[PDB]
Amino acid sequence: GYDRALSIFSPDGHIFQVEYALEAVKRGTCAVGVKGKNCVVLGCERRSTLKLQDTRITPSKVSKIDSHVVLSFSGLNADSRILIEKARVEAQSHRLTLEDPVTVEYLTRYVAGVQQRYTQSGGVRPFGVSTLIAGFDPRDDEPKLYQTEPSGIYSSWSAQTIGRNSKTVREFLEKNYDRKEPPATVEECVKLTVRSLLEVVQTGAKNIEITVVKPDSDIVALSSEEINQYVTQIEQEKQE
Amino acid sequence: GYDRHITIFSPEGRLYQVEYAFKATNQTNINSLAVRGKDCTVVISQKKVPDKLLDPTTVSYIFCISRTIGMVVNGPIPDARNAALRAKAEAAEFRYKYGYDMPCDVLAKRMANLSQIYTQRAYMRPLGVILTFVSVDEELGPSIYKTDPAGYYVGYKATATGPKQQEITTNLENHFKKSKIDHINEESWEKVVEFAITHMIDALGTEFSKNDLEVGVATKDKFFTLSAENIEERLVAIAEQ
Amino acid sequence: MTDRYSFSLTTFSPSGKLGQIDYALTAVKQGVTSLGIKATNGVVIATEKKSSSPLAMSETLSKVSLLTPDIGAVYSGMGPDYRVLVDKSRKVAHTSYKRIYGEYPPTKLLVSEVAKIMQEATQSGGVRPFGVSLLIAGHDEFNGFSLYQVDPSGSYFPWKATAIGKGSVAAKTFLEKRWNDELELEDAIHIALLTLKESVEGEFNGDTIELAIIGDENPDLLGYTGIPTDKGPRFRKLTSQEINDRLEAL
Amino acid sequence: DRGVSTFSPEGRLFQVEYSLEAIKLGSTAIGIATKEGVVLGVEKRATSPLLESDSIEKIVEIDRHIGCAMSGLTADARSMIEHARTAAVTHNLYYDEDINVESLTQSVCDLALRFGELMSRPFGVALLIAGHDADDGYQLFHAEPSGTFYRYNAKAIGSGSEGAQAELLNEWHSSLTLKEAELLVLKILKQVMEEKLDENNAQLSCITKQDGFKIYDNEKTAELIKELKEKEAAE
Amino acid sequence: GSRRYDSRTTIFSPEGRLYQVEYALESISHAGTAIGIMASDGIVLAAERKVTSTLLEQDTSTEKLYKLNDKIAVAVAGLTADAEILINTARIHAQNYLKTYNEDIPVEILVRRLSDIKQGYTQHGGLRPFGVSFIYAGYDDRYGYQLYTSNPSGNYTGWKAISVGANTSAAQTLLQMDYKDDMKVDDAIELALKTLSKTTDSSALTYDRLEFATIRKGANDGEVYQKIFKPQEIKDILVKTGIT
Amino acid sequence: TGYDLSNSVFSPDGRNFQVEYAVKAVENGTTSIGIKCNDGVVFAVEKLITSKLLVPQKNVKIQVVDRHIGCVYSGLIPDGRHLVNRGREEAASFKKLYKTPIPIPAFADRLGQYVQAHTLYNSVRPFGVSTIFGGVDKNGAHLYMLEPSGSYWGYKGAATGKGRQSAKAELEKLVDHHPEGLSAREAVKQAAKIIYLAHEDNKEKDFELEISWCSLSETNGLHKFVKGDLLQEAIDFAQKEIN
Amino acid sequence: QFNPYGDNGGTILGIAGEDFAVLAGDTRNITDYSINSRYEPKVFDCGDNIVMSANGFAADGDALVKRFKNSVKWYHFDHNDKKLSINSAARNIQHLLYGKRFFPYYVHTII
Amino acid sequence: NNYDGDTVTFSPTGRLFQVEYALEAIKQGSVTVGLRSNTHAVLVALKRNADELSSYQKKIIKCDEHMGLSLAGLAPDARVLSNYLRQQCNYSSLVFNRKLAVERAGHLLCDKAQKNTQSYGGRPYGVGLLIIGYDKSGAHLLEFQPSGNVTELYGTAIGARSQGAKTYLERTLDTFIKIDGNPDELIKAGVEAISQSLRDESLTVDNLSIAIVGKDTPFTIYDGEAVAKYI
Amino acid sequence: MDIILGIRVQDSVILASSKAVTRGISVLKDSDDKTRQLSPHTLMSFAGEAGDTVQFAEYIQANIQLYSIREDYELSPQAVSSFVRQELAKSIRSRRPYQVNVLIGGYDKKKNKPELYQIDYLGTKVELPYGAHGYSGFYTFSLLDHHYRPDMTTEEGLDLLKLCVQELEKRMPMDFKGVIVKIVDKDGIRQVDDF
Ligand SMILES: [Mg+2]
Ligand SMILES: [Mg+2]
């Protein structure tokens, strides 16, 4: 087996392979998550350097880890599949031994743990992936949104964004999200999510994806149809 | 230019480490020669004991591999002994597995295949030696098969190895172009040894005492090396010209 | 701590070249010319036996090798690499085919195995590619006669006729002129001897030329009778004499 | 490159020294050890106002009688804490007793130097391990990724540590009460933190022989910040 | 030690790219263009070969189009040898699924495992990635007809029409131009050739430099036939569409 | 260049520079000799006294292998010990299978092949010692000297370390002026002298003499240390000849 | 068939006082109807004010006592010369015995 | 220069720079002294605090009842080597019912250090040790150096400014070698020797560490209030 | 543990599974569900050695649930039964084989037809109109052979089962403390909450 230490310290006290893994995330298509008062919404930019795509069969950018937790990501698509697979296996393993589905914090801590392990293991590079992990703990209606990054650090967010032009939309949400007043309705939270993407996303076309997770394993994704109805509506609210 | 340090190709499709291993071959500054009789194969190598503190009997580049196979080495002694021990192990194992004595040309191929591996795998360095195997094979008669660091091997009518190899080769080439046969047309191994030492003296243009030579003889069912006295006897007969 | 080389010694350069495969092909280019021709009722592979010394007995060093009773191989490039590849090619024909199906592998299947061994030297840790290109000529009941070329990359292509090594460019032009899809084997042997004269500088006779056919079955070469469905090997190396016989009507 | 386990001509391990630079970049952590208990305090340092500050876990329980504060690459501490907890719980199973704070620390510190061509690099995190045992009472230990650990009456680690440590050198005496130490940690944190110390961007904890290791709730700390600001207005 | 001679195939650039993946993609861009077009009633795979000598054996050959099972085929762009390693893996992986579930493998699951292998070579093992891109043309009874591509990175995506190899920028524009969803197989066949005709790097686009395959609904209804065109059938479909 | 940075790399000359660099560490070491005698061998070595804080008699450098073999070496001491430990494993394993204790030529090749093996890979360093060893087998006495390359021969006498040239020349004298044979007790005195003569080059510090011998008549074919009385006799003989 | 166990007889007796404890055993070692020794002690001072006897099969008995005595030694080394509590010793011995659950020490242990 | 990349590389002069760099970490280490009569062997070690709020790095480790060592340099390496030595002492005790010869402890330590200096991806130990022990041939003192060089001495010192103590002991040789039957006089001589290696700061209660082993003395460590008697 | 039955009717599969759990001399429990839901439209009942049955059933359940998440798709009952057979056929040449017999009752949503699979611990699978494991078959197969018709309603199936359970309660020596009945149809899995 290949032994080489690829993630090592530099004289300034930085681990360049981790920091370069973040550069891969920076380049990744934008992803955003927003806590409602009793929902979480995951929004995802999808680049339009290519049409003639088949979107029935192309990997969707939000993945179910269990029936009550979802995971979106920014960065290397191939790398994300490995993290998703491990997380889905760990979720079934947790159910099998603890006789309870994972808490979002636990599933996050697991994925974060995998990401970290690759930052101090021989013969592996870190994951070029940051993740948003969103859902509801079992028999709990308080929503959960966590972020992980190639270093393996993870934390909870009222709302957060990752990938290209995420500094733009983090500035938007910082400005447009009251913690004292979270988006009370589903529609309200979905709206704020689309709005933040429209700072960055070009057109409303098949450029945006929204997935909405409600409590008790109530996960459904919106079709262009129903997102267009927000894109149409927010456009006609710019008339000041 | 790290393609010069390990056995990977240079841009002109060359393995420099294999080429440099050939240069180590001549580092001992010894010349060896091998010819075939009707009944025998004779190997002769120069014996140089520079230091007086050396026990001259322990200084040898000829090895008795098996009952039937003898091997002479052109190259440094540590690589020579490494190669010898291996061929001894390989010839013993072959006998145990397949129920008959390992032929000269098969051991040569086997040792050449081992040499080939060092030219392809990076962590193994080639051995800086050329291995001249001699026997009287039970199927093929008197045999000379020779191996180099490149993993190349071929059978020889006769052969020479060392710095002065080219002079010894053309000398032997000329004898065979003339005599017009595969071998030294001689009855006794004693007279094929005499032939070998003679054509070594002519090609090198130098004279040998009994301690300047090392001789090995392969016959049917035993390969043996001559003592100082068996050579001295043989040198004395060469005097009658 | 012996083998630390568990990483590829063949990697992609910024231009997308695989340096060590290109260099292995360069090593083949320097190699002595070898060629193969498909006739309608046989295949011929041939090469020059360039001697290192006149004291070398060049019948001992065989460049054309039997792989199965119906498959032969020849090469240009590094002889030692060819030797160990023939050994692995013969064994893989048994371990991963004959020991399973009780019959020898068809030409393209055995070629596929040889190619696979050469591809692994192109990717596996701590090894250089093989410095040879093989021409593998063989017959199998359900494909008839065929000829394949295997390169250091592990790529293989089927040929009507081709050559490799030194004077391949020259010879490939010669073969194009003279090849038709109605050649009887004897005609292809003759053409192969003409094509090989061009590239051979020194002596050109039965002792400096190695030539084998994949032709008719040879009961005389089988070694036993009593089984009516074992008719013997289609691979036959032409003798020193048999080559010189044809160099008359040249 | 060069070996991962190689010495500088000075006679120090490059990869250990470079990890020490990573720890200096980390958020501040302070421990003060008193005869009434040991106090651990950390700067949380939320990187944005949107991230929920109480999800930042830089003080962590090891056993009921041992706590841990960290500074540096905090993801690197997952496995150090895991090992420490396992070591503490394991020792209890084998000996039906609490495991000495020094023995715990030594166990954690054995991990630190098991790296090179075992993990690929040293840890990018220093730990303040603070606990109580019957034999040596209240203890604070500083566990570096060099494999060395020092016992401290008080110690600061992270970006604020050079100033904070000289500040602790002044104010620490052998007769500090717990309440004094709690305030003193709040004081020195507020003094070195970039942003302004409140009960959301800083966190407290202590370990008493009586009630073991407790992380203070935001409400409890908020009232100690009031008590601190009031106190410094006087004189 | 040996560290000296290690390229480190599985590291990031300071920009967070994988040097060896990028250089493998550069390698593939000099390979014969392969095109996949998915119709309503089938899929077309068209592959353009490299310059070929007269002596090269025309008919009994398939360097670009390989069968994975009865319902799935791939078009290759890159090193043929690297592709055959990955193909035999995929063929086995398809047979394992069949033995386990007594059902033909869904096209995506096969595509994912191959992509996950490629991914592995980019993250661990210190070996060079596979210098191969695949166009997967396959049918299953969940999504019907599916077109995919996978590249050395381990990334894979779904397509209505796609090209890999040389002049894919040029080819992707021509396909984006003349492709529509209702399009039938025989239209897609014609588009595939027209596209290679315009993007080829030699003047004549003759039958002898083309490999061609279709996966059709056409059979005894409900079942799927997979056709790797004989050279005479490529000569016919080239005369029929009036390119010769 | 770059040819000298990795062990087991051939230079364009055909040399392994790392083995040649190993030899420099040997030459840098204290002097050590072997004198082969009538029915045995004698080993002597120069032990530099850094300080009177060295306990005399107590930092032994000559090592026994099996019962019947003496080993002494110049250069990196740890490397020498590691090679003897290997020699001991080799001799134990030979005795175990073949019952007879290992012959000296057989034993020499065991060290020869092992040391040579550390010139085959870039992942190991060559041995920083030349080893003079030997003893009495069923075919009489053997003296051997082995170098970092794995090169070894049988010797009449041999020397290595700083004082290798003086010793070398002083051995050459004995080979000429005693052609028929040197006795065991003779070689012990002669060994003491040559170490004193070769101390010329390590003139800086004064030293402690250490002799061992393996004689068929005098030690019964076993390796024993020359202690107490017969040591002081040979020390005295040597003091007399540097006057 | 090889029987790895034997029975060396003997009898041991532990009584706890208010501020003392006795651990007694006969000094006779037997196999079948033979006496091996009339004085072979099987009650040992393991250090840290602890006495131990493993009665039954003397080989397993001596193996266990020896292992526990070593356990005391390493407790000192690893926990800064801390005195091993009788309860801590008891628990340690459980793990020694249960370590061979599927090839037991054929001994009755009293400390 | 180019030849200090790792331990498997010789310099053209024939040196192992990685070993010399390891040797260097010892001289940065706080001074420790060893000396012994015919009846006792003493270690005095000057301990180094990190700052005014820190403990004093313990420099003396017990290996058996009859053996133990003091360290200068990387303390984790001293832990590994002391722990290895404990096992060898323990092995000799369990298998052969035999207290391990101090001279053999030397050979095992030497042979362990050597393995780390000859093969790829390793690193020399970055610590020097002084090993005292009363065995079956009297009192012993050993100086271990991570090159693998182990030497039996009457006295010595290693670490920062250790040259001072080392010359005092070189002078006082005949005084201390005949402190037989007196434990305190043999320690006093050691505390005087270690004082030749001080500057600015000198021996307080909790910066000084003394170990003694001998004829009727189990290897024991004296710290804090139990060294005040010697300041 | 003891008796497990299955019958496929017009458009559902009915699994009846004994409620008794006996540890030697005592009936420890009289309300045990010898069933796991593998997917929303697939139910497995199991009987055999203690511990292995729950361990095997839960292990299959986790594997099928993992597949569902990964592909966002429910495997056909045929595919699940083929997977389960392979696991058992795997385990029979293990060091310690799973000692578990199973009935897999599933509604194939893609084919709108109910399917019942009987697999023993050897990995011997058959698709059956009605199935049982162990001694259950010997009593009930005569009743089912007679009364069974491929086009029966669910309530007809339950009535034929009621007869089967009655004959068992009459002639079985062991008191199996009645059965828990479950129905698998196009709308999923539900429990007939008394018998
Ligand atoms: Mg090599
Ligand atoms: Mg059955």
The rounded radius of gyration (Å) of the Cα atoms in chain E is: 18
With residue B39 as reference, give the H or E element that holds it: none
**Structural contact between residues C13 and E20, judged by C-beta atoms closer than 8 angstroms:** no
Q: How many residues does chain A have?
A: 240
Beta carbons within 10 angstroms of residue D51's beta carbon: 19
Q: How many Å apart are CA G36 and CA C233, to the nearest integer? A: 80
Beta carbons within 10 angstroms of residue A102's beta carbon: 26
- In three-state form (DSSP H/G/I as H, E/B as E, the rest C), the secondary structure along chain H is CCCCCCCCCCCCCCCCHHHHHHHHHHHHCCCEEEEECCCEEEEEEECCECCCCECECCCEEEEECCEEEEEEECHHHHHHHHHHHHHHHHHHHHHHCCCCCHHHHHHHHHHHHHHCCCECCCCCCCEEEEEEEEECCEEEEEEEECCCEEEEECEEEECCCCHHHHHHHHHHHHHHCCCCCCHHHHHHHHHHHHHCCCECECCCCCCEEEEEEECCEEEEEECHHHCHHHC
For residue A68, give both structure tokens.
């009550």
HSE-CB of E237 using CA atoms within 13 angstroms = 26
**Structural contact between residues E196 and A91, judged by C-beta atoms closer than 8 angstroms:** no
The SS3 of residue F131 is: strand
Rounded to 10 degrees, the C-alpha dihedral B17/B20/B25/B28 comes to -130
C175/E126 Cβ within 8 A: no
For residue E76, give both structure tokens.
């290759």
DSSP codes joined into one string, A66-108: SSSEEEEEEE-HHHHHHHHHHHHHHHHHHHHHHSSPPPHHHHH
Q: Please list, in sequence order, all residues whose beta carbon lies within 8 angstroms of the beta carbon of residue D139, skipping any fewer than 6 positions away.
A: D33, D38, D101, D102, D130, D131, D132, D133, D151
**Structural contact between residues F25 and F203, judged by C-beta atoms closer than 8 angstroms:** no
Q: Which pairs from B81-84 meet CB under 8 Å and 24+ separation?
A: B81/F109, B81/F112, B81/F113, B81/F116, B81/F150, B82/B127, B82/F113, B82/F116, B82/F117, B82/F150, B83/B111, B83/B127, B83/B129, B83/B131
Q: How many Å apart are CA C110 and CA C67, to the nearest integer? A: 9
By the 10 Å C-beta count (0-12 exposed, 13-18 middle, 19+ buried), G75 is classed as: buried
CATH of domain C1-249: 3.60.20.10
Beta carbons within 10 angstroms of residue H29's beta carbon: 26
The SS3 of residue G8 is: coil
For residue I164, give both structure tokens.
């089967």
**Resolution (in Å) of the shown entry?**
3.0
CATH of domain F1-243: 3.60.20.10
F5/E1 Cβ within 8 A: no
- For B30-158, where are the alpha helices, taking DSSP H only? 77-98, 104-120
> What does the buried/exposed string (b/e) look like for A140-178 if buried means 16 or more CB atoms within 10 Å of the residue's CB?
eeebbbbbbbbbbbbbbbbbbbbbbbbeebbebbeeebe
The rounded radius of gyration (Å) of the Cα atoms in chain B is: 18
Tell the CATH topology of A1-240: Glutamine Phosphoribosylpyrophosphate, subunit 1, domain 1 (3.60.20)
The SS3 of residue I165 is: helix
Which residue, chain included where needed, has tokens 């929503």? A143
CATH code for the domain of E17: 3.60.20.10
**Structural contact between residues G91 and G48, judged by C-beta atoms closer than 8 angstroms:** no
Residue F30 is among the residues annotated as catalytic for this protein: yes
Encoded amino acid at H184, one letter: D
What is the DSSP-derived secondary structure letter of residue E41? S
Q: How many Å apart are CA B6 and CA B8, to the nearest integer? A: 6
The SS3 of residue B241 is: coil
Q: How many Å apart are CA I2 and CA D5, to the nearest integer? A: 63
Encoded amino acid at E161, one letter: A
What is the DSSP-derived secondary structure letter of residue A52? S
DSSP codes joined into one string, B188-239: SHHHHHHHHHHHHHHHH-----TTSEEEEEEETTEEEE--HHHHHHHHHHHT
Q: How many Å apart are CA D231 and CA D224, to the nearest integer? A: 10
Backbone φ, ψ for residue A110 (5° rounding): -65, -55
Distances (CA, A) of F171 to B109, E224, F186, I111: 45, 93, 13, 100
Most B CBs within 10 Å, among E2, E4, E5, to test the B interface: E5
Q: How many Å apart are CA A146 and CA E14, to the nearest integer? A: 27
CATH code for the domain of D143: 3.60.20.10
Distances (CA, A) of I51 to A166, C230, F101, I99, I101: 52, 59, 61, 9, 13
Give the largest Cα separation in chain D, rounded.
59
Distances (CA, A) of C97 to B95, B130, C110, C217, H211: 29, 38, 9, 21, 74
HSE-CB of D49 using CA atoms within 13 angstroms = 12
Looking at the DSSP bridge assignments, the partners of residue F41 are: F36, F214
Nearest to D130 by CA among D234, D208, D186: D208
Catalytic residue, candidates F1, F30, F31, F131: F30
User: What is the nearest CA distance from E6 to chain B, expressed in angstroms?
Assistant: 11
User: What is the nearest CA distance from A4 to chain C, expressed in angstroms?
Assistant: 9
Nearest-10 crossing angle of helices C107-120, C79-93: 130
Q: How many Å apart are CA A148 and CA A162, to the nearest integer? A: 10
| Structural domain spans, chain C | 1-249
HSE-CB of A180 using CA atoms within 13 angstroms = 0
Residues of B within 8 A of E2 (CB-CB) are 122-123
Which residue, chain included where needed, has tokens 């040991």? D38
H119 touches chain C (CB under 8 A): yes
Give chain I's end-to-end CA distance (angstroms, integer).
19
What is the DSSP-derived secondary structure letter of residue B121? B
By the 10 Å C-beta count (0-12 exposed, 13-18 middle, 19+ buried), E217 is classed as: middle
**Structural contact between residues G7 and G56, judged by C-beta atoms closer than 8 angstroms:** yes
User: If contacts are CB pairs under 8 Å, which of residues 58-97 in chain C contact chain B?
Assistant: 58-61, 78-81, 83-84, 87
For residue E117, give both structure tokens.
């292998």
Beta carbons within 10 angstroms of residue H217's beta carbon: 15
Sign of the CA dihedral running D120, D126, D131, D133: positive
H152/F58 Cβ within 8 A: yes
Q: How many residues does chain B have?
A: 241
Backbone φ, ψ for residue E17 (5° rounding): -115, 160
Q: How many Å apart are CA B182 and CA B176, to the nearest integer? A: 7
**Structural contact between residues B216 and B70, judged by C-beta atoms closer than 8 angstroms:** yes
**Structural contact between residues D77 and D83, judged by C-beta atoms closer than 8 angstroms:** no
Please name the chains neighbouring G, where neighbouring means 3+ C-beta pairs under 8 angstroms. D, H
**Structural contact between residues F45 and F31, judged by C-beta atoms closer than 8 angstroms:** yes
H18 touches chain F (CB under 8 A): no
For residue C81, give both structure tokens.
């690499």
Q: How many Å apart are CA D199 and CA D218, to the nearest integer? A: 5
Nearest to C77 by CA among H230, B119, B71: B119
For residue B131, give both structure tokens.
């291995």
**Structural contact between residues C159 and C25, judged by C-beta atoms closer than 8 angstroms:** no
**Structural contact between residues F34 and F158, judged by C-beta atoms closer than 8 angstroms:** yes
- Residue E200 belongs to what domain range? 1-244
CATH of domain I1-195: 3.60.20.10
Looking at the DSSP bridge assignments, the partners of residue E210 are: E48
Nearest to F12 by CA among A218, B20, H161: B20
Domains assigned to chain B: 1-241 (3.60.20.10)
Angle, CA of H149, D7 and D151, to the nearest 5°? 90
Nearest-10 crossing angle of helices F184-197, F228-241: 50
H-chain residue closest to G66, CA distance: H94
Nearest to F63 by CA among F214, F233, F165, F230: F214
Nearest to F122 by CA among F2, F241, F1, F6: F6
Touch between chain B and chain I (3+ CB pairs, < 8 Å)? Answer: no
HSE-CB of B88 using CA atoms within 13 angstroms = 10
By the 10 Å C-beta count (0-12 exposed, 13-18 middle, 19+ buried), D25 is classed as: middle
DSSP codes joined into one string, chain C: ------SBS--B-TTS-BHHHHHHHHHHHHSPPEEEEEETTEEEEEEE---SSTTB-TTTS-SSEEEETTEEEEEEE-HHHHHHHHHHHHHHHIIIIIHHHSSPPPHHHHHHHHHHHHHHTTTSBTBPPPSEEEEEEEEETTTEEEEEEE-TTS-EEEBSEEEESTTHHHHHHHHHHH--TT--HHHHHHHHHHHHHHH--S--STTTEEEEEE-S--GGGTS--S-TT----SEEEPPHHHHHHHTT--
Q: How many Å apart are CA H76 and CA D105, to the nearest integer? A: 13
**Structural contact between residues A133 and A146, judged by C-beta atoms closer than 8 angstroms:** yes
Q: How many residues does chain C have?
A: 250
**Structural contact between residues F119 and F149, judged by C-beta atoms closer than 8 angstroms:** yes
Q: Which residues of E touch I (CB under 8 A)?
A: 99-103, 106, 109, 141-142
Q: How many Å apart are CA F137 and CA H28, to the nearest integer? A: 51
Distances (CA, A) of C201 to C48, C49, C166: 10, 12, 12
Backbone φ, ψ for residue D141 (5° rounding): -125, 140
Encoded amino acid at C141, one letter: E
Q: How many Å apart are CA D83 and CA G50, to the nearest integer? A: 32
For residue D228, give both structure tokens.
């601190």
With residue G60 as reference, give the H or E element that holds it: helix G58-78
The SS3 of residue A235 is: helix
For residue B203, give both structure tokens.
């090609």
With residue A115 as reference, give the H or E element that holds it: helix A104-117
Q: How many Å apart are CA D141 and CA D107, to the nearest integer? A: 13
> What does the buried/exposed string (b/e) look like for F34-71 if buried means 16 or more CB atoms within 10 Å of the residue's CB?
bbbbbbbbbbbbbbbeebebbeeeebebbbbbbebbbb
Sign of the CA dihedral running H146, H147, H153, H157: negative
Angle, CA of A77, A78 and A80, to the nearest 5°? 65
Q: How many Å apart are CA H121 and CA D17, to the nearest integer? A: 19
Residues of D within 8 A of A11 (CB-CB) are 18, 21
Domain count, chain D: 1
Q: How many Å apart are CA H21 and CA D13, to the nearest integer? A: 10
Q: How many Å apart are CA D104 and CA D109, to the nearest integer? A: 9
What is the DSSP-derived secondary structure letter of residue F150? S
- In three-state form (DSSP H/G/I as H, E/B as E, the rest C), the secondary structure along chain D is CCCCCCECCCCCEHHHHHHHHHHHCCCCEEEEEECCEEEEEEECCCCCCCECHHHCCCEEEEECCEEEEEEECHHHHHHHHHHHHHHHHHHHHHHCCCCCHHHHHHHHHHHHCCECCCECCCCCEEEEEEEEECCCEEEEEEECCCCCEEEECEEEECCCHHHHHHHHHHHCCCCCCHHHHHHHHHHHHHHHCCCCCCCCCEEEEEEECCCEEEECCHHHHHHHHHHHHHHHHCC
Nearest to I104 by CA among I46, I153, I34: I46
Beta carbons within 10 angstroms of residue D136's beta carbon: 14
Q: How many Å apart are CA F41 and CA D223, to the nearest integer? A: 89
Q: How many Å apart are CA F235 and CA A232, to the nearest integer? A: 108
Q: How many Å apart are CA D181 and CA D187, to the nearest integer? A: 10
With residue I112 as reference, give the H or E element that holds it: none
Which experiment gave this structure? X-ray
> What does the buried/exposed string (b/e) look like for F111-141 if buried means 16 or more CB atoms within 10 Å of the residue's CB?
bbbbbbebbbbbbbbbbbbbbbbbbbbeeeb
The SS3 of residue G97 is: helix
| Structural domain spans, chain F | 1-243
Q: How many Å apart are CA A69 and CA A106, to the nearest integer? A: 11
Sign of the CA dihedral running D53, D55, D59, D61: positive
**Structural contact between residues D62 and D81, judged by C-beta atoms closer than 8 angstroms:** yes
- Residue D206 belongs to what domain range? 1-235
Ligand 2 centroid to Cα of residue I120, in Å, is: 5
| Structural domain spans, chain I | 1-195
Give chain G's end-to-end CA distance (angstroms, integer).
35
